[PDB]
Amino acid sequence: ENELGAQPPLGFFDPLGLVEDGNQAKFDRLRYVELKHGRISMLAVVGYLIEKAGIRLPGNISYDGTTFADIPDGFAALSKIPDAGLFQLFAFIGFLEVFVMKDITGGEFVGDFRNGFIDFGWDSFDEETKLKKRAIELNQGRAAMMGILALMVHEKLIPLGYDADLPIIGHL
Amino acid sequence: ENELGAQPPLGFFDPLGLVEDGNQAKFDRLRYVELKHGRISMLAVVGYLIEKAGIRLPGNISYDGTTFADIPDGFAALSKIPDAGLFQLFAFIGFLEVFVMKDITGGEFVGDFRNGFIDFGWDSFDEETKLKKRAIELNQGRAAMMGILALMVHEKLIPLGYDADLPIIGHL
Amino acid sequence: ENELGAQPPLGFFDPLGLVEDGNQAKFDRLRYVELKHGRISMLAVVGYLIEKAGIRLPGNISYDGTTFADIPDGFAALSKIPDAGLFQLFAFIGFLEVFVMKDITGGEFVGDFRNGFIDFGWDSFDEETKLKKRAIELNQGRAAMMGILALMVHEKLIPLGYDADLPIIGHL
Amino acid sequence: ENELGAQPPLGFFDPLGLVEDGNQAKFDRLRYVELKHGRISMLAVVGYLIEKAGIRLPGNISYDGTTFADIPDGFAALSKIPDAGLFQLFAFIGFLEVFVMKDITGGEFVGDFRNGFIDFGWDSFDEETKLKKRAIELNQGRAAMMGILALMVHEKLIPLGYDADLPIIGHL
């Protein structure tokens, strides 16, 4: 729990010293802050790659004649969703976030009690269940958090990432 | 036994007082009724969602010359199966119900000895294969039992559900 | 490894005799005989089902110019395989058969050291991997061994079975 | 560690004599040498089979205008990958190889802490994940290491193997 996320090459890495003080709480806070940023960023780059590869759904998203094909890839997408779609995102994802399914308290050592079936194994593998798999998911987030800072600041110049791979790949 | 089923955010929820006996024996039977309406309504909503997606088989269903596309979506479908087809549901399901493979003897901890393959079984995770996964299937049933009472009443007042979704979705 | 196969609603069912000898050494051999006829009949019936469904491969089988569609459905298929292909069935299967990866000779509880999704060795359910799933496959063989005695006599009329189903299904 | 690999019908089989030193420290190194040549040859033969079945990707590979169909089957494929692609092989594989994830160096029983279907570390059977499934993969390499010595010599005089198989298969 403490010894987690500090595997090689960097080890424990508090460069500026913001967990230089003590408590479990602000290390508790910043961990599940980091994990939830991890979990969200990982599905957002996999959400990015499956959008930008041309994998869509046929049919209109509403009465508008807005298809899923008419919704373009990239950052015009989430904005050009119709509003009543986004308020039904905030209803469901909202209820799923706070309330249904995925408890969020203070970062409770988030266990969520599901995972699979034969997989969580304490009583079988005390270094596979935590300290490796629980370490990688942190880092796969640490890649993907650095993927979306990437994903925005690339697309801030005109070609996006399907468009950015037909023209220029070089920097400004 | 007891110590299963509902859960957060309800726990033991018998608010009208139908089971407040203090007797397990009446609670045993109504549990396995709920398991069965659990299991049936679950395969009827996913049956409903796959029938409503236009997911059909090719070819005629008989020498009546009814294709699988001819049989309409919704409540009419099971009703206008040819009668000799409805006997053969009965002949097979009825054998499958009352004695073979599923035996419902008397409502008995229908355990049926179909326990996944590795997954979700004893001599592994304690929390999961019972007191959670045994609880979810029941609550999965609890969603789908309410899904059909909906679905029937959605079909009762309007046409079928795909014809409920191209026109009005608001109430009467 | 003695209490194999039969079960409710039969139990030990040896209605004619030749097995109630009081010695299991003959019961020993016939049990593994039932397993192997089990294993062969089960993949022959599903082979019969997948051949009949129109599921074939593209292309010619050989320099003969016989496609995978050219070989008829039903009994005549194995007989009019070109002879050199039947030698290579004999070369590969017989090396796999009398010798190894399967090694059958001596004939009981070879076990083959091979499990399914390799689920169900041991240190799991000791009641599901032994006495039950061991019992189904043999009983699954019991259905499929009956399926072929049928199937050959169904084909014996003078068509194949898809040409038994488009015309008459009633008895002679 | 010592009882591993070969098996019926050979057992320990060192016929010319290089390894019967009485000291396992050299037997140690050559074992993990055989594992890695095992692992590489097995993905190269199935790479060779999937490349030859006509299973390619759509689109050009690069600015060159080389499609995935343009790159010929067989030996010449890896040689005429454009140079900057061969570095990005050397980039990513060489990062993945020496240390980082697969960590090979030192060169014996690295173990890599990866399971198949998270199946089979331990705390199941102790007879198949050690001494059998660990034995097959090495032997699976023993087939595939011979498969490429073949494959190169099959390609050496003859064209690519799909053009070995439409003309003559017999020896020179």
Add this chain to the structure above:
Amino acid sequence: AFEDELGAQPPLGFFDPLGLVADGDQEKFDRLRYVEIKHGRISMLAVVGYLVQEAGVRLPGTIDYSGKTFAEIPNGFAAFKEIPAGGLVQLLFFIGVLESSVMRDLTGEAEFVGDFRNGAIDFGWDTFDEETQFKKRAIELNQGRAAQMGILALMVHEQLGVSLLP
């Protein structure tokens, strides 16, 4: 705190006008000193690289198989326009191998921050006494600090259009 450290020397002495290491944190200081030596080692190669390219000295022959030669490639930021795209990826990547796999403390036996010998390459560091060992570290730091302002000039002045070179 760190007034007696390396790089504190005449005429300025200990010099931290921002008070960045005024808290006395060794680990913060060890980072900054490592960050200071690292830019310095780059800038010392960067100015000599800039001056020898501006003198016209090139590697012989072609940079790729398409016939693009080194002599066509100018000095400065305009070099990156004519270095081919496969070249610019490796120049970025191979230095990242030096960042990841080579130029760091791999073994943990470094006597200080920026000691990258790793028990592998040593040209006789222990043949200097402790005052010469301190002196050669003080030269490398201050040749480093000089070149950081030196290369920062030579990059700003290429963009200004006002040359500092004859």
